């Protein structure tokens, strides 16, 4: 119950500060930058590219390594911030299609796969290019 | 500082799911009822009351006890769902003033004080009045 209470407070204060357009922490600023970049990417750029969800055809039998081999296609010509945004959008799309197909049980493993891929394959590039601070500096507020 | 790749993932996926009417967490209906009740309270009903923030000057040296004794004033004549809503709004107002004062870092402290107050002073009343799912039935 105590953890739920904390979660209510955090949600309420985040929502209220966001509603006023206030940036209160580097973490909040990174998350806001990513949300907005994903929205812009999905609206106006994603349809130009081959649909990576068509390569995975996620099932409850899909393993991390199958996700990883499909994501490697997105980074076949290297890492940039745009492709990192596209990676988040791809994960978001796997979750949305999972829930659309009455397989919400996949949502938690998709999140773990995304974390694993970021930590294993993108973290060195992120640090080399000024960390998430630079992402916010170029694409945030 | 964003010192967690997993936190960015969970945040982004929560957002993307919400845009399709789907929920990351089970607390989703309460969060949506509390945000809407907060917005509604602040837009007109709040204007009737003395501004409780004028009694607090939150700095890195302010004790939890100072916050606790000002918040108690909300519940002087009992706990009800509206006063719980007002408590959250009050918390939100404190955070906005904290950022405006260049004390952004105190937002997380205020969050910690609110969760502490909620757990000590309000959790018993909440349990004894049908929990958050009643709040959702009334304000959702
Ligand atoms: O979500 C996805 N699919 C599901 C879906 C749902 C609904 C509709 C369509 C598809 C998804 C995300 S991704 C993707 N395929 N992309 C691939 C295919 C494999 C190879 C590949 C190779 C490079 C790139 C890529 C992606 C983004 C890129 O930049 C984005 C710039 C930007 C940033 C912020 C906001 C707007 C725009 C770039 C680039 O410019 O280098 N290059 C992308 C794919 N599919
Ligand atoms: O955020 C606050 N202040 C900063 C601020 C910013 C901008 C503008 C004005 C103030 C704030 C939240 S609070 C407050 N002071 N309120 C006090 C003063 C001390 C005594 C006190 C005592 C009872 C109540 C109270 C609060 C809410 C209440 O019900 C709300 C019902 C409702 C729900 C959903 C939507 C709309 C309305 C009630 C009640 O009717 O019981 N009673 C309230 C204060 N200040």
Curated annotation (Swiss-Prot), chain A:
Changing residue 133 to A: No effect on caspase-1 cleavage. GO terms for cellular component: Bcl-2 family protein complex; centrosome; cytoplasm; cytosol; endoplasmic reticulum; mitochondrial inner membrane; mitochondrial matrix; mitochondrial outer membrane. The keyword Transmembrane helix applies. A motif (BH3) lies at residues 30-44. Disulfide bonds: none annotated. The keyword Membrane applies. One of its GO terms (biological process) is cellular response to gamma radiation. Changing residue 120 to A: No effect on caspase-1 cleavage. A motif (BH2) lies at residues 124-139. Bcl-X(S) is expressed at high levels in cells that undergo a high rate of turnover, such as developing lymphocytes. In contrast, Bcl-X(L) is found in tissues containing long-lived postmitotic cells, such as adult brain. GO terms for molecular function: BH3 domain binding; channel activity; identical protein binding; protein kinase binding. A motif (BH4) lies at residues 4-24. Proteolytically cleaved by caspases during apoptosis. The cleaved protein, lacking the BH4 motif, has pro-apoptotic activity. This phosphorylation is partial in normal mitotic cells, but complete in G2-arrested cells upon DNA-damage, thus promoting subsequent apoptosis probably by triggering caspases-mediated proteolysis. Phosphorylated by PLK3, leading to regulate the G2 checkpoint and progression to cytokinesis during mitosis. The BH4 motif is required for anti-apoptotic activity. The BH1 and BH2 motifs are required for both heterodimerization with other Bcl-2 family members and for repression of cell death. The loop between motifs BH4 and BH3 is required for the interaction with NLRP1. Homodimer. Interacts with BCL2L11. Interacts with BAD. Interacts with PGAM5. Interacts with HEBP2. Interacts with p53/TP53 and BBC3; interaction with BBC3 disrupts the interaction with p53/TP53. Interacts with ATP5F1A and ATP5F1B; the interactions mediate the association of isoform Bcl-X(L) with the mitochondrial membrane ATP synthase F(1)F(0) ATP synthase. Interacts with VDAC1. Interacts with BCL2L11 (via BH3). Interacts with RNF183. Interacts with GIMAP3/IAN4 and GIMAP5/IAN5. Belongs to the Bcl-2 family. This is Bcl-2-like protein 1. The gene is BCL2L1. The chain holds residues 1 to 197 of 233 of the full protein.
């Amino acid at each position: 119950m105590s953890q739920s209470n904390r979660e209510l407070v955090v949600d309420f204060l985040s929502y209220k500060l966001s509603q006023k357009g206030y940036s209160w922490s580097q973490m909040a600023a990174v998350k806001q930058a990513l949300r907005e970049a994903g929205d812009e990417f999905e609206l106006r750029y994603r349809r130009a590219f081959s649909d990576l969800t068509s390569q995975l055809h996620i099932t409850p039998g899909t393993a991390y390594q199958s996700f990883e081999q499909v994501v490697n296609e997105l980074f076949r010509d290297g890492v940039n911030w745009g492709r990192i945004v596209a990676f988040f959008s791809f994960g978001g799309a796997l979750c949305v299609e999972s829930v659309d197909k009455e397989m919400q049980v996949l949502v938690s493993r998709i999140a773990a796969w995304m974390a694993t891929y970021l930590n294993d394959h993108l973290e060195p590039w992120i640090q080399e290019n000024g960390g998430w601070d630079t992402f916010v500096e170029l694409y945030g507020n």
